[PDB]
Amino acid sequence: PNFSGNWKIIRSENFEELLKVLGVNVMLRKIAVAAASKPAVEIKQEGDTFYIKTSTTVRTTEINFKVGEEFEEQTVDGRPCKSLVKWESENKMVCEQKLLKGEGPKTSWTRELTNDGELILTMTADDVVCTKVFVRE
Template identity: 70%
Template sequence: MLRKVAVAAASKPHVEIRQNGDQFYIKTSTTVRTTEIQFTVGEEFDEETVDGRKCKSFPIWEKENKIYCKQTLVDGTGPKTYWTRELVGDELILVFGADDVVCTRLYVRA
């Protein structure tokens, strides 16, 4: 599993984002896997954490161009996780958090 995560982290993923008001579709493709999520800001939805655990996610607008999403595990225990996505010019700043650990990834529009 760690090798797959390392390969994915080193790759240049392709991210497709479609927005219609508060409704979002986000598809992220890497050499390891492709993930797709659909959600409406302000409504809970089912999602998987980065490591594959099922969770309930609740996205809110943190500011005009930034979404904050809290994730709550469906079963078991684990770190408190969240993600944020913020558009700044031609850049997408994606932040994943798990308790006190934070990972930031920067995407640039092609």
Template identity: 45%
Template sequence: MSFVGKKYKLDKSENFDEYMKELGVGLVTRKMGNSLSPTVEVTLEGDTYTLTTTSTFKTSAISFKLGVEFDEETLDGRNVKSIITLDGNKLTQEQKGDKPTTIVREFTDNELITTLTIGNVKCVRVYKAV
């Protein structure tokens, strides 16, 4: 788990606007979301992980135990049930709610590749280790 304690800053994003549209995010919020370059960090204390996303607009953190469902308020304000599992260097998050979403975070030595899928819309965001 070489990704624990590392920080990753957004480098490039593909199809993020379409992803936010599919979630029902309004135009102004989408424009703001597209202009941000957030930093992501994963920490681990005992068996509890914390995933923190920081931007100039907002900082959010979710704490979770692998394989245990938890309540989450998403960055766009939706309330969902989430479960996160770890397979090698991939954290897979399933969000259940009005619009089920899958988020796969794949960690390499120098990058975090996040693939967000809702329905037929897929978004890829690449973060570089800082």
């Protein structure tokens, strides 16, 4: 597959519930959920090397990783973590995350290119799964 491109959101589910289980107060959540409903995503992939930029009106993240190599990033709520991405299947990556400090919900994410040309991002905290679906811009 090639994830490379600019991606636009077409569906979001369960992002408020995800932030809820992470313990974000309703007021800050409200700012976040609205902004996260319109994220713009740029991916540059060369083989196992990835750059992913996710931009919203309230927060932008930029990560560089290589599939199979540990790296440091932040959880969806900004907590520093170490992460490892692997290919779960041909067009699907899964990232497992461990907090650098302290105790917290177990978090992960997955990104998959689907047969129809879309991209599915999932983000999980404990049991709660957020799904966001994108199409190329």
